[PDB]
Symmetry: D2
Subunit: 150 residues, 4 copies
C-alpha cells in the first residue's frame, strides 16, 4: 500500500524542517537536488528567507542490480555554508554521491526509509522500505468512480 | 502535539471505511451525527451510492457541575439496517447515547482514540489519547508568516 | 469545458455564503438537500454555529425528456426560520420542488447556472450553462502520468 | 479582492501550461527564476520530462547567481508577471529564450511569450508557498 503525500502535508513537513534549520543566517544558500528536491528547496527558501537557490542535476537509471549515475549540471564548491535538500532517501545511493560532491554541506530530506536514514544529517518523516511514496507533483485531482453504484 | 487533518486525507480514510461497508445493498440508509459526522456521512453516501441520509443532532446542556445531553433532532427507528457515523470517538460520551437510540445500527467513525475504541463497530485511524484532531472544516487556507526575515 | 472544484475552494465559497447569512441568530436550523447539499450544509452549520441540521432526500431518475421525482425522506415543517441549501442550481427542477415543500425557507446554493439563477434566494459563484462542475466528493488525489514521455 | 491560489490550482494551471509547450523535445532545459518560478519550474520539469533544471536569482537589480547562454532552447519560468522590472531584466540575459509565467496582469501581459491565467492589476495573488492549513475562527458563536 502506497503512502499518499498531498501538497498540504509536504508543506507542513517542509516547515517542520525549516524551523529545525534555524537560524537562517548560518546558511549561505540552498542547493536543491533536481528534480525531487526542487519543491522542498523552494519551500525552505521561502521560510528561511533565502534568495540564492541553485541546483545539482543528477540522472539515475537502474540496469538490473547496478545504478548508472550521470550528473548533468553541478553547482560549484565544497558546499560551504549551503543546505543540500532532496525529497527523500531510500537506499542512500544519491546521498553518498552528493556527499562526494559537497562534503562540507548540510544534507536534508523530507522522508527517509530505514536504509538511507542514517546517511542524512536531518530529515522529518519515517517511511518503511516496503512502502512507496506518491509525491504531490506526480498526482492530480481527477474523477474517481464510486465504490458501489447504486 | 496537534494532529492536522486535511479534506484530502479525510476522503482517503472515508474511502477505506466505505470499502469495508461493502456491499452497499445491506444498508437502507445513513444516519450522520451532527455536526462532526455530516461530512464523513456525505462521503460514505457518495461512495456507497446511498441516497437516504438522515441526521442526529446532539448538544450539551450544563447543569451545575454535570453536562447533560440534549437531543435537538433525531431520526427514526432503532437504526436497523442503518450506518450511524461520527467524525471520531474520543471518550464515547456521545457514543453511549447513539447506541441507546440506535441499538441495531452499525456505528462507525473515521478516527478513534483508545478509550473510545470499544464503543465503535469499526474505525479507520488510531489517534493517541493526548492528541487533538483538527478537522478541515475548522480550518482554511490562510497566509502564514515566514520564519525568517 | 470542465470546472474543477477542490475542497479548499469549496470551503472558501461556503464561508463567503455564511458571512452573507450573518447574523446566525435569525436562523433556527439548516435543511440540507441530500446528497449535494450535505457538505455545503455542514460548512454553513460550522460557521454559523447551528446545531439543528436536517436533510431532504430526493431521487431524480431521468427518463428521456422527463424526470421522475422521489422524496425518500423529508424534514418536517414549512421551513420557517430555516436555511435550505443545495450545492448547485442547474435548471431549477429541484428548486421548484423544495420551494413547494418549504415555502417559508431561505433557499441558497454555492454555484448557479444562468437557468436556475433566478430561482435561488442567494448563491456564490456563477457557472456557465455548458460547463460541467466536478465536485470534490466525486474526486480524489491519484497518480497522473506526465504529459510527455522521457 | 485577494486572489487565493491553492497548490492544486497552481498544479492544474502548470499542466495547462505544460500542454502548450508540447512537444518537449524542442527544449534543452528549464531556467527557474527563483523563488517564484521554482515550483512552476519544478512542475514543468516533471510534466515535460526535462531533467536539466537551473536557476537565475535576481535581486538595484543585483544578480546573485545565473546560467550562461542566450536562452536558445531553454524555458524561463516565473510564477507571475505584474509590472516587468525583473521581466525586462530576464529578457536581456536570455534574449532568444522562451519566457513563460502562470499568472499575468494586464501591464505585464505583453512581456511574456506565454501564460495561463489573467489577473486584474489591482488584485494581490496569494501563492500557496506563502500559506498553510491553519485553524480559522467560526464566523459566529451560535
Ligand atoms: N516518488 C517516489 N520516488 C522514489 C521512491 N523511492 C525511490 N524513489 C526515487 C526518487 C528518489 N530516489 C533516490 O533518492 C534513490 P536513493 O539514493 O537510493 O535513495 C529514487 C518512492 O517511494 N516514491
Ligand atoms: N457533480 C455535479 N452534479 C450536477 C451537475 N449538474 C447537475 N447536477 C446534479 C446535482 C444537482 N442537480 C440539480 O440541482 C438539478 P436541477 O433541478 O435541474 O437544478 C443535479 C454538475 O455539473 N456536477
Amino acid at each position: 500500500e502506497k503512502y499518499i503525500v498531498t501538497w498540504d502535508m509536504l508543506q507542513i513537513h517542509a516547515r517542520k524542517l525549516a524551523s529545525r534549520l534555524m537560524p537562517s543566517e548560518q546558511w549561505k544558500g540552498i542547493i536543491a537536488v533536481s528534480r525531487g528536491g526542487l519543491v522542498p528547496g523552494a519551500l525552505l527558501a521561502r521560510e528561511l528567507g533565502i534568495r540564492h537557490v541553485d541546483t545539482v542535476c543528477i540522472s539515475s537509471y537502474d540496469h538490473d542490480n547496478q545504478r548508472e549515475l550521470k550528473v548533468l549540471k553541478r553547482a560549484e564548491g565544497d558546499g560551504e555554508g549551503f543546505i543540500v535538500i532532496d525529497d527523500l532517501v531510500d537506499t542512500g545511493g544519491t546521498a553518498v554521491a552528493i556527499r562526494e560532491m559537497y562534503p562540507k554541506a548540510h544534507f536534508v530530506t523530507i522522508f527517509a526509509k530505514p536504509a538511507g536514514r542514517p546517511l542524512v544529517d536531518d530529515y522529518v518523516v519515517d517511511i518503511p522500505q516496503d512502502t512507496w511514496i506518491e509525491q504531490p507533483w506526480d498526482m492530480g485531482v481527477v474523477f474517481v468512480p464510486p465504490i458501489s453504484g447504486r
